Symmetry: C2
Subunit: 283 residues, 2 copies
């Protein structure tokens, strides 16, 4: 309950510089590539084999997998600097902005800015610009150069709104059969963004574009963690207002006590975010 | 120092059956596929990115990665049947046979036999035959059955010999810079089998063929674990003989190859597995 996760827009300047410097350090030590690789690995673990579902996305484990993901990331951040906690990007408020690209998340001292149309939309500002930050492709091989392109696609021209978010928190069930993209009246599938998609979570990914635009390369962009921090917050909220489903008979890897590949951690291990030792501000 | 890992050729008929049934249970519960994926994932964690070194192969962590891999596998077997330990395929002994493909490891009560040439070398004998056991491809989707094709390639017509193993056991350095496929005077690279390859470990894969023939899909064949137990036994013997010698690199190698680095996809370090007796098991030849 001690580690406090803060709204990016509530961060002081040196809180932002310290977060940024820690990420780069994780990157120089080779630790950051473990999270890109883990996330890609999970995308290849289909439950059961052949199914649309994988360990991290498109099924019930989406939320607790990403909670465990961000939890391990935060610990590695803390091992470099015990004062660093993972912020969240509250995109529901940034959507209200005239030009959400002008949000202070995108400043030169934090995430850097939008892509540059001449340089194929390569990011050329901030600490993660090309030459200052290398990316890896789907194969684990060097791909060179972070890209972003806010709202370029017909499908996600806008960030999801607080209206969009308030409608997901109403859903009464965590998840429903058959625990996938078609799951109806499903908090998880609603938050993930496949109901009349792309919405919420999936919409943020398409709006940002670049590596963020395609799931297997998305964690190349450090804003991946800030986005998913916000998703984890929405879920923790839902866990106050209103457990987990399936408790059994889902495909292996999605049940309450199944390990989530590529870890041994179960959903049950992370149901209560407070017991994991962190809290979001406003809590 | 208590779970005894036995030569496959020494297993009783009941031991053979209990092992196979336990593996089948692992597969049915969805657990076996986690080991296939872990191995596939490790192969695309390159150290550093761009190098052909990866977390589990072609560098110093080849041996401890697999010690940890097999230890986790043996634990999962034990949780199903605490009397079942991971046996080892002593291929260097099979190589002395007129026809190694007649080894008892390939009998219908254990690993099953060679691939059927009429069926594109699909295995159709033993408990892992097509229709009883489904493989998956590098992408995580079902494939069409186990395949094997013993001794089919020109580079690997034979299994490695007892002398090939004895020769490797004379190498005095665990590994050497630059800790890769070209490492010379290196026990790790020698056992791995790249110099004037394919030898030893790489030669076994090429000899078996089918999914075993391409390292990213090799754990689809349960014999993967039996083969790598023989590898783990040979390294355990190397540590007994060269007791003065330790893992290399201690430091300064690529991240994920040093003594105290995490071995992707786990947090387990090489140091954590250096002493196999402290992991709870011994090979029968140690008595």
């Amino acid at each position: 309950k001690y580690r406090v996760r803060k709204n990016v827009l509530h961060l002081t300047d040196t809180e932002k510089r310290d977060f940024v410097r820690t990420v780069l350090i994780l990157k120089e030590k080779g630790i950051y590539d473990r999270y890109i690789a883990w996330h890609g690995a999970a995308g290849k673990f289909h439950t059961p084999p052949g199914s649309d579902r994988n360990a991290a996305h498109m099924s019930s484990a989406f939320l607790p997998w990403h909670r465990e993901y961000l939890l391990r990331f935060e610990r590695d951040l803390q091992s470099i600097n015990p004062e660093v906690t993972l912020p969240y990007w509250e995109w529901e408020t940034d959507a209200q902005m005239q030009d959400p690209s002008q949000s202070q998340i995108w400043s030169a001292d934090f995430m850097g800015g939008n892509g540059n149309p001449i340089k194929d939309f390569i990011v050329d500002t901030g600490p993660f610009a090309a030459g200052r930050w290398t990316t890896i492709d789907e194969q684990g091989n060097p791909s060179g150069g972070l890209k972003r392109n806010f709202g370029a696609t017909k499908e996600a021209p806008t960030l999801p709104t607080r209206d969009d978010v308030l409608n997901a928190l109403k859903i009464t069930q965590y998840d429903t059969p058959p625990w996938d993209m078609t799951s109806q009246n499903s908090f998880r599938n609603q938050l993930e963004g496949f109901i009349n998609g792309p919405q919420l979570h999936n919409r943020v990914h398409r709006w940002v574009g670049g590596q963020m635009g395609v799931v297997p390369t998305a964690p190349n962009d450090p804003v991946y963690f800030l986005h998913h921090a916000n998703v984890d917050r929405i879920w923790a909220v839902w866990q106050i207002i209103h457990n987990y489903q399936p408790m059994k008979n889902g495909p292996f890897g999605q049940n309450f006590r199944d390990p989530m590949y590529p870890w041994n951690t179960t959903p049950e291990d992370v149901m209560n975010h407070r017991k994991l030792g962190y809290v979001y501000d406003i809590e």
